[PDB]
Design a protein around this ligand. Structure first.
Ligand code: NA
Lengths: 373, 368
């Protein structure tokens, strides 16, 4: 019945979306530093516009990093290798305005600020993520796969997707019923016709990614909805690091306290503690303690242990929220310097996080649920 | 059933907020000459540098050196001793400018949220209202000369203790206030801390929320002589939670500053706020979250959703019917209803886009 259902929408963007190009370059720079100096402090912003990658920010590191190589290899990997595509790693301007200095008990490091971090998890997918954002990410990944394997050789790197799912409530848990609307816009070459693109997007992309049970004759498809998308990448739109923070996290679900992730080393609590909060939420759901949960961790400036933790289970547990809090405190140490140790965050793992979401992928330590005792 | 919640705000001199303000100064400069200008102006700030990048379609002839330098002057950076000077900084322009109804398509895809709560008269969370008003008070006392040692860069953080009341939230007390603000080389720490408590906090925070246990962290990292872009980097659209609800409600990810009305990231977010505030002020709920979404080139929203946290006797489906009966969320209609061609955007770029009565999206619509 209409009266018990609701719609929810999330979006994702491809590796060649100009904002995502900047996130990936910022984390490539972070990784390059961490490979040589595990204690590097990095706050690297990237700006991309026609013919230009500009790096700005502050670094304290012993590393000697070849920025030409880091930037150009990232752009090559993304797939911008010719003027005909709007951007070329071989010929773009790389401007380095980074200010790098040399440097002069980790468990007791105080929080740098008073602040709030959220973790979220939901049993609606195997990834413990909202279906809307999982499907949106996977659609972009599929486009990249078919571009790179030459199945759809007219594809270019810039893309955006958006998925609206129709849900019912099930005692605080959310149950996906059907995909209501899908949007896909993807950059393309000058030869391919609109109808062939739209057919490919439906048959080779959407039907390869979205389970058939969620698609029906009423599902609305907006495929290349503005018509041609030849001009794209940084030529079409300036990009900046930290401008896809909702794409990076929960797609509008749960909550967000405000910090961007990319270009920031693990001593930035707004990255590492966000990862740890996710780890807690996912562990609660995978442990069968709730179906859906929002974990809200507050820190007091200069204090290592969290000031307060609140667990909101949306009514999806037999346990009280106080009981869940006891379980969390028994099983997790959310001091910033201890999170870094437990999730091994000094490793150069960050470039992989910078497209397709920081959450919902099994290859990251914060996505391996902890067995709860 | 009590919990803590923290929101942050930053001052006009924080390098991210410098960029937001400059981006909206540029937008306003275009709209003053060409009300139909299309603007997507990103700003980057770092040691000695303001860079503009993005895309414009406009008939305006705008002197970007003047617009940028006048904005930096207004913010208050006029000397090396403060870390930045409008007279002598580098301004670089990488803007690509071209010459150029109700069914205009959305300028992009995306999702946007609106939120309102009955916990304050302005229908905003207390944490973010107080954080913003603390920064606004610092700017007021800086600009009126009564605290002559103040400089432009600041950060505030406010932690409030709340109780839950059947989906509504009830502020009980201010738990902690943090204020860090840039200052001159003459003033002593103790005098600054005293002034921050007496002239700023006590002027802004209702006495009923302060008690003997409230924690005050005033200039907590010590001296703060240099600020702004010096040894730092800022970008447009890196304070999107500060700009909106301070962690409350939800966010669709889109930044506001530097964008004209066809960018639904801005206009639909303003309209969603207007809807949410209209629902709460109309007595239909105590607390509400509105979602809307668009596809590029399509006028009507793809989806509209209303979540009332259990704070209404009406169903969420009923509230959605009321919204659809009373609001037309096509971008071409929103622009008319909220008067979005006016050059009023620079004023939105610090102290929050919401909760301030001078904006059309803050005037609730009488429903039905
Ligand atoms: Na990596």
């Amino acid at each position: 019945i209409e009266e018990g259902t609701f719609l929810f929408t999330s979006e994702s963007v491809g590796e060649g979306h100009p904002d995502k190009i900047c996130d990936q370059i910022s984390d490539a720079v972070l990784d390059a530093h961490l490979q040589q100096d595990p204690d590097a402090k990095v706050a690297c912003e990237t700006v991309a516009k026609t013919g230009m990658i500009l790096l700005a920010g502050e670094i304290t590191s012993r590393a000697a990093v070849d920025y030409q190589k880091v930037v150009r290899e990232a752009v090559k990997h993304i797939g911008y290798d010719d003027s005909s595509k709007g951007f070329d790693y071989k010929t773009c301007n790389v401007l380095v305005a980074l200010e790098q200095q040399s440097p002069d008990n980790e468990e007791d490091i105080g929080a740098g600020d008073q602040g709030l971090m959220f973790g979220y998890a939901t049993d609606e997918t195997e990834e413990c993520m909202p279906l809307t954002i999982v499907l949106a990410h996977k659609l972009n990944a599929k486009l990249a796969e078919l571009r790179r394997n030459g199945t759809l050789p007219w594809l270019r790197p810039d893309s955006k997707t958006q998925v609206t799912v129709q849900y019912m409530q099930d005692r605080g848990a959310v149950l996906p019923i059907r995909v209501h609307t899908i949007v896909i816009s993807v950059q393309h070459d000058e030869e391919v016709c609109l109808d062939e693109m739209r057919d490919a997007l439906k048959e080779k992309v959407i039907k390869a990614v979205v389970p058939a049970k969620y698609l029906d004759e009423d599902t609305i498809y907006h495929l290349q909805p503005s018509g041609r998308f030849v001009i794209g990448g940084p030529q079409g739109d300036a990009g900046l690091t930290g401008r896809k923070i909702i794409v990076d996290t929960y797609g509008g679900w749960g909550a967000h306290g405000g910090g961007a992730f990319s270009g920031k080393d693990y001593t930035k609590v707004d990255r590492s503690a966000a990862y740890a909060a996710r780890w807690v939420a996912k562990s609660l759901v995978k442990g069968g303690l709730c179906r859906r949960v929002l974990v809200q961790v507050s820190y007091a400036i200069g204090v290592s242990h969290p000031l307060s933790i609140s667990i909101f289970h949306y009514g999806t547990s037999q346990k009280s929220e106080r009981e869940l809090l006891e379980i969390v405190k028994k099983n997790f140490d959310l001091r910033p310097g201890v999170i870094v140790r437990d999730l091994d965050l000094k490793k150069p793992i960050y470039q992989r996080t910078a497209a397709y979401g920081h959450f919902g992928r099994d290859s990251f330590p914060w996505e391996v649920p902890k067995k709860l005792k």
